[PDB]
């Protein structure tokens, strides 16, 4: 059947519903159509409230009925959002509300467009697509809002599998800056990255705006099989392995790489080069370790 719902401001709305439907589902339908979450609604029939665990048939609600909707001033959960200016705003949010929703609500309450917003919670940056439940944002939590001026852009970088990451970049950021950001957010050395957009590889010397890359653009990432610098390692059994390294790598890094190659834990790794020990602290540059120089391990 079809029923009508009227507000104190004569906004009549039509709802296609069945008499065997609960009232929380009628509230969910009102949320689908008007965007009013069910916790901020109050439905009244003939002067009586409508309880969520009750059906329309129980209230003798026939066809062409007219319910009355009163909207509340608050919901069950609120968050605080503090600008860099120091102004605190309250938001009526929900555990299912995604970051897109809270950015839209900040726009509603402050006019700040969502493309210029980035939200920080407990040292982490919130990304569009995930909900407050994912980021474990409880009631009365405080999000720090910051603005990406000077051409702030969210770009996505997707590998041949599906592992998509999000990067904050400017049009003037060069492809080398982007590979550096990928190195900082995923660990991939830039000498192993190849970035592609619209089908062509991106040269290290051009900017993002040179390739007409705009907001929400998806760059494809391809991992080389090789880097620029490789070193050889000989196991206690005598097998040789090759590690893709950089001169700025620390002995902890090369020990993690050894753990990836041969599964040996780093505490049982003692590296030797030219009759010397390799302190965990110093880097490969501090040991003059050149490309293709071999190292020996043994405890």
């Amino acid at each position: 059947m079809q029923i009508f719902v009227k507000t104190l401001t004569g906004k009549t709305i039509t709802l296609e519903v069945e008499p065997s439907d609960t009232i929380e589902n009628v509230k969910a339908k009102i949320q689908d159509k008007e965007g009013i979450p069910p916790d901020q609604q109050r439905l009244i029939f003939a002067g009586k409230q409508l309880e969520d665990g009750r059906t329309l048939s129980d209230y003798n609600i026939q066809k062409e009925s007219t319910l009355h909707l009163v909207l509340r001033l608050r919901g069950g959960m609120q968050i605080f959002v503090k600008t860099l200016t120091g102004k605190t705003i309250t938001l009526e949010v929900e555990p299912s509300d995604t970051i897109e929703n809270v950015k839209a609500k900040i726009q509603d309450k402050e006019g700040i467009p969502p493309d210029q917003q980035r939200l920080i919670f407990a040292g982490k940056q919130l990304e569009d697509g995930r909900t407050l439940s994912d980021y474990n944002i409880q009631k009365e939590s405080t999000l720090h809002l910051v603005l990406r001026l000077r051409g702030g852009m969210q770009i996505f970088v997707k590998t041949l599998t599906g592992k998509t990451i999000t990067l904050e970049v400017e049009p003037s950021d060069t492809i080398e800056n982007v590979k550096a950001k990928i190195q900082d957010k995923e660990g991939i050395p830039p000498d192993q990255q190849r970035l592609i957009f619209a089908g062509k590889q991106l040269e290290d010397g051009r900017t993002l705006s040179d390739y007409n890359i705009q907001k929400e653009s998806t760059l494809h990432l391809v991992l080389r099989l090789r880097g620029g610098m490789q070193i050889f390692v000989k196991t206690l059994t005598g097998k040789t392995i090759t590690l893709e390294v950089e001169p700025s790598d620390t002995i902890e890094n090369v020990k993690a790489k050894i753990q990836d190659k041969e599964g040996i834990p780093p505490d049982q790794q003692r590296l030797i080069f030219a009759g010397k020990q390799l302190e965990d602290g110093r880097t490969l540059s501090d040991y003059n370790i050149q490309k293709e120089s071999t190292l020996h391990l043994v405890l």
């Binding site: 001033l73 608050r74 605080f80 503090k82 605190t88 705003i89 309250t90 009365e140 405080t142």
Partner: protein, 60 residues
């Protein structure tokens, strides 16, 4: 029947209740502002606790 008297009573109740709704909304807005300011204070105290904890942690 004296419908004018009941009509005027209903209109007076109508305007009074509208004013009451307006007043209660203003009161809720004031309470919300005070709650926001209290959250500002609470965040300042959280920052102070974080600083003191960082000072204590420096003790080895």
């Amino acid at each position: 029947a004296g419908a004018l008297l009941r009509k005027q009573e209903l209109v007076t109740q109508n305007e009074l209740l509208k004013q009451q709704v307006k007043i209660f909304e203003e009161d809720f807005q004031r309470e919300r502002s005070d709650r926001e300011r209290m959250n500002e204070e609470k965040e300042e105290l959280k920052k102070q606790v974080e600083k003191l904890q960082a000072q204590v942690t420096l003790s080895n």
